[PDB]
Amino acid sequence: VQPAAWQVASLADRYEESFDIGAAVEPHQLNGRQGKVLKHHYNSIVAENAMKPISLQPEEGVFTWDGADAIVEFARKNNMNLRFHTLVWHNQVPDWFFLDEEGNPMVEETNEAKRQANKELLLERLETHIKTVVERYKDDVTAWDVVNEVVDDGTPNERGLRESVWYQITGDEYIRVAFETARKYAGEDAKLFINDYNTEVTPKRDHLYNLVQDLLADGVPIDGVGHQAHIQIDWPTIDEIRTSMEMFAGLGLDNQVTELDVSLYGWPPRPAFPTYDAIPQERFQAQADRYNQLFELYEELDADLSSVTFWGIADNHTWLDDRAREYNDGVGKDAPFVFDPNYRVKPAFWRIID
């Protein structure tokens, strides 16, 4: 019988000399016990959804600020650092960005001259998006995910870049423009990150390594790498995680762990247990060991790691459940955090609080 999260020692306090402790939040989770857990264990937050491009500009010139503002207000009120997630991504990004002046998808265009025009139009839209959003949240955001997931899992081109709508339309230019615009409007002091998953493993790691070396050499402003750390119990290895973080630190970049979850399953996450109560104790203990080693590593690397954020708060809310449902016929429960669905501490908590 584990105690409630607000009854144990604060994680932020335990790691205050090492790094921020962060959580991804939705507006509705800012009160209640989620609220209470946040104020007690965390000194940083990020918007799980309320700040992605489609959440902020769903039609051109129509900005929808309420959710994001609610999160800001809460960070402000509770003296918490705030990551911005995210200025550019190829999902939860609104359709209108990528349509030509006659409403057709720019990617379908076959004329090399109109494509060039479409590239100028898209980059202009991006610049206008970035400038507006940054200008509003400039004074509260302490770290910016300028771009998210622009590096490919494979290698479809020279630079190892995701051939998303952004790249198909503009090559690598949106990346340069994203950072340069974000620097421009946020000021020299703002911390700009390139955020991604599987940063721990090659080829992707090397591509990002190469890419940030390139961009830096050309004076494109980029302060750090965001390691999503959607990880599993036995993968990636501790040595892979360290090597990625220490490589990027070698370049003078900051590292943050930005969306950490420790799934009870592999990839794809099958077989999942159908409910939390069905999850055998065995799995909470393998997770607990994984967390112990993971936070041993983080603390060891704390010279080069400023923030560790979980992609959620307690196991009642986690996108991993969508994945579990997806790969197990609509019924499936994961449990990635150190607090359970009822805000009680899990074996993993004790392993990282000490």
Residues that constitute the known binding site? 18, 292, 302, 305, 351, 354
Q: Of the candidates 302, 325, 326, 344, which one interacts with Na ion according to CB under 5 A?
A: 302
Residues in the annotated binding site for Mg(2+): 18, 292, 302, 305, 351, 354
What angle (nearest 5°) sits at the alpha carbon of residue 354, between those of residues 249 and 303?
Answer: 15
Q: Which is nearer to Na ion, 19 or 42 (CB)?
A: 19
Query: How far is the CA of 298 from the CAs of 8, 144, 230, 241, 290, in angstroms?
Result: 21, 21, 15, 9, 12
Shortest spacing between CB 354 and Mg ion, in angstroms: 5
Using the rule CB under 5 A, is 19 a contact of Na ion? yes
- Sign, CA dihedral 212-216-218-219, equals positive
Q: Which is nearer to Na ion, 5 or 308 (CB)?
A: 308
Q: Which is nearer to Na ion, 195 or 306 (CB)?
A: 306
Q: What are residue 249's phi and psi, to 5 degrees?
A: -60, -35
Shortest spacing between CB 306 and Na ion, in angstroms: 5
Query: How far is the CA of 88 from the CAs of 62, 150, 176, in angstroms?
Result: 17, 9, 12
Quick check: 185 and 159 in contact, CB under 8 A? Answer: no
The reply to whether 60 belongs to the active site is no
Q: Which is nearer to Mg ion, 230 or 351 (CB)?
A: 351
Of the residues 59, 259, 299, 326, only one is catalytic, namely 259
Q: How many CA atoms lie within 13 A of 255 on its CB side?
A: 26
Shortest spacing between CB 293 and Mg ion, in angstroms: 8
| Binder of residue 19, out of Mg ion, Na ion, none (CB less than 5 to 8 A by kind) | Na ion
- Give the binding range for Na ion (CB under 5 A) out of 1-9, 210-218, 259-267, 295-303: 295-303
Straight-line distance from the first to the last Cα atom of the chain, in angstroms, rounded to the nearest whole number: 19
- Which positions touch Na ion (CB under 5 A)? 19, 302, 306
